[PDB]
Amino acid sequence: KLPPGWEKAMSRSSGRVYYFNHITNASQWERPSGEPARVRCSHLLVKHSQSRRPSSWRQEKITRTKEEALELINGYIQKIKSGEEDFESLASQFSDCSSAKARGDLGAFSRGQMQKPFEDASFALRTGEMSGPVFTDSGIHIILRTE
Ligand SMILES: Nc1ccc2c(c1)COC2
DSSP string, 46-77: E--TTSSS---SS-SS----HHHHHHHHHHHH
Experimental resolution (Å): 1.8
7-43 burial, b if ≥16 CB within 10 A, otherwise e? eeeeeeeeeeeebbbebbbbeeeeebeeeeeebebbb
Please check whether residue 5 is in contact with residue 23, taking contact to mean a CB–CB distance below 8 angstroms.
Answer: yes
Q: Where residue 27 sits, what CATH number does that domain have? A: 2.20.70.10
Name 145's bridge partners: 41
Residues 10 and 45 in one domain: no
Output the ligand 1 site: residues, CB below 6 A: 45, 97, 106, 114-115, 118, 136, 138
The amino acid at residue 123 is: F
Active site residues: 43, 97, 115, 138, 141
Residues 64 and 86 in one domain: yes
Burial class (CB within 10 angstroms; exposed 0-12, middle 13-18, buried 19+) of 116: exposed
Which candidate, 117, 118, 127, places its Cα nearest to that of 99?
Answer: 118
Phi–psi pair at 13, nearest 5 degrees:
-80, -35
Method used to obtain the model: X-ray
User: How many other C-beta atoms lie within 10 A of the C-beta of residue 110?
Assistant: 12
Residues 43 and 57 in one domain: yes
* 3-state SS, residue 94: helix
Q: Where residue 105 sits, what CATH number does that domain have? A: 3.10.50.40
Residues 75 and 137 in one domain: yes
* 82 alpha carbon – ligand 1 mean position (Å): 26
Cα three-residue angle 43-18-139, rounded to 5 degrees: 25
Cα three-residue angle 28-126-100, rounded to 5 degrees: 90
Residues 72 and 105 in one domain: yes
Residues 57 and 24 in one domain: no
Q: Domains in the chain: how many in total?
A: 2
Expressed as residue numbers, the domain containing 92 is 38-147
Residues 56 and 97 in one domain: yes
